[PDB]
Design a protein around this ligand. Structure first.
Ligand SMILES: CNC(=O)c1cccc(C(=O)O)n1
Ligand SMILES: [Zn+2]
Ligand SMILES: [Zn+2]
Ligand SMILES: [Zn+2]
Length: 459
């Protein structure tokens, strides 16, 4: 049990308005055949065009919602809609394109998928709410066969060209006309009552229904993300490294240690309340403070209510000292807080569109994150950049230009001239900090936080 058996039954009720007379008894084997594809009893890495929910979850970066609406069946034009927001009109002869024949439509499909997916995944997973026309339109832009590699590199092939008779991955497919060996999943097989809109609108108010194919494609992928990452959470699935994952994770650990250490030095809190990941470790192990932990897993649906986290009877006095919320998404932070909160609006290869304003942040594990909300930070202010260090000024062991900065809080800068070691550490810290901010993380702190209070820690 690794792939979806072609002999698995497929419920055809959702298909019978577009395909009247469709047999109630149907397998994937007969469905693929009805779509105009032949699998030839082939043991060459592609056992089924359709995949299991578990396989779809492992390949969430490949998800592309896809819907087809009858504009007017080989006689009428079709509107092809994708969760990228694109609508193409194919004639049989929110971006909306005029009607064109399939030979040109297929070139646009290959360009769109390659640009969307080259940095996300080695494949495409079409996420459907299958009614019939989308399945029968696939033969006009999809080719299947044995698993192949790119003609220009070692990656698996995702495109085919009829002009050159060659195969390419998403990076090398310019000029290619067929999508090759795509995967697909029909959400309608998961057991739902009622249509797409009624199921999507139960959990999301951010996507409307203009009645165009791309709106349905967006809602379909949204419902699939809600089912697989919001109401169901699996932090055991590992995802490949596709970008700056390791650097971002190291940067987050560096910034956390820096900020918490400086807040403890500047305001001398007797107690710190660490609210979040039940597996968290003291980020400033040498600090004098009474460190108290409170367990809260990442919220994937709505942000936690501070009344539930803190009230219903612990130190009990969360008002004493400082609260540390490092990626613990709450509705309204207390005024005595140090906060790291992921901004779901950020554009990156790690952050995928999510459900109800939220986003799916995929970095080693998949984390659906509730929508970023500026009102959560009304009791706090943005944490300004600063570098602090009490380590001795000594080079040990990279070219140099003297550093001049009001934000390098060191003994050497206090004395009037930043030493080489602290200039190197400052530049490294600034790089880690900028990496973390650009990845989507935002930092917030209690209003009394003032770096001017750090200078007297050098006496
Ligand atoms: C096996 N390859 C992958 O899982 C993958 C994922 C994202 C990007 C790329 C690439 O750009 O090659 N590859
Ligand atoms: Zn390639
Ligand atoms: Zn939605
Ligand atoms: Zn120094």
């Amino acid at each position: 049990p690794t792939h979806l058996s072609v002999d698995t039954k497929f419920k055809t009720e959702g298909l019978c308005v577009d395909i009247p007379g469709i047999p109630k008894d149907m397998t994937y084997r007969r469905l693929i055949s009805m779509m105009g594809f032949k699998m030839n009893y082939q043991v060459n890495g592609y056992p089924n065009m359709f995949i299991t929910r578990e396989e779809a979850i492992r390949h969430v970066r490949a998800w592309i919602g896809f819907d087809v609406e009858g504009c007017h069946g080989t006689n009428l034009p079709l509107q092809l809609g994708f969760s990228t927001g694109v609508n193409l009109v194919a004639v049989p002869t929110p971006l909306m394109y005029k009607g064109l024949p399939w030979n040109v439509v297929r070139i646009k499909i290959v360009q769109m998928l390659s640009d969307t997916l080259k940095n996300l995944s080695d494949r495409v997973v079409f996420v459907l709410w299958a009614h019939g026309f989308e399945l029968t339109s696939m033969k006009y832009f999809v080719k299947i066969g044995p698993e192949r590699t790119c003609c220009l590199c070692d990656r698996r092939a995702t495109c085919f060209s009829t002009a050159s008779d060659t195969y390419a991955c998403w990076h090398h497919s310019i000029g290619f006309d067929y999508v090759y060996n795509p995967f697909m999943i029909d959400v309608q097989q998961w057991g739902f009552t009622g249509n797409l809109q009624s199921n999507h609108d139960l959990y999301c108010q951010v996507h409307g229904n203009a009645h165009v194919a791309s709106c349905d494609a967006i809602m379909t992928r949204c419902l699939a993300v809600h089912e697989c990452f919001v109401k169901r959470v699996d932090w055991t699935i590992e995802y490949p490294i596709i970008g700056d994952e390791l650097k971002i994770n190291a940067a987050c650990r560096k910034v956390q240690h820096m900020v918490v250490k400086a807040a403890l030095l500047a305001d001398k809190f007797p107690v710190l309340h660490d609210i979040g990941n039940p597996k968290a470790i003291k980020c400033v192990p040498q600090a004098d403070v009474e460190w108290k932990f409170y367990d809260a897993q990442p919220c994937s649906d709505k942000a936690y209510k501070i009344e539930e986290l803190f009230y219903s009877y612990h130190s009990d006095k969360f008002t004493d000292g400082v609260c540390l919320f490092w990626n613990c998404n709450v509705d309204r932070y207390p005024a005595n807080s140090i906060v790291c909160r992921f901004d779901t609006r950020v554009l990156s290869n790690l952050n995928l569109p999510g459900c109800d304003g939220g986003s799916l942040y995929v970095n080693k594990h998949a984390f659906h994150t509730p929508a970023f909300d500026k009102s959560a930070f009304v009791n706090l202010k943005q944490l300004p950049f600063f570098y602090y260090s009490d380590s001795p000024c000594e080079s040990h062991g990279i070219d140099y230009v003297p550093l001049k900065s009001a934000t390098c809080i060191t003994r050497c800068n206090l004395g009037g001239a930043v030493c080489r070691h602290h200039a190197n550490e400052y530049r490294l810290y600034l790089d880690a900090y900028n990496m973390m901010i650009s990845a989507g993380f935002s930092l917030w702190v209690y209003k009394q936080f003032d770096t001017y209070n750090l200078w007297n820690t050098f006496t």
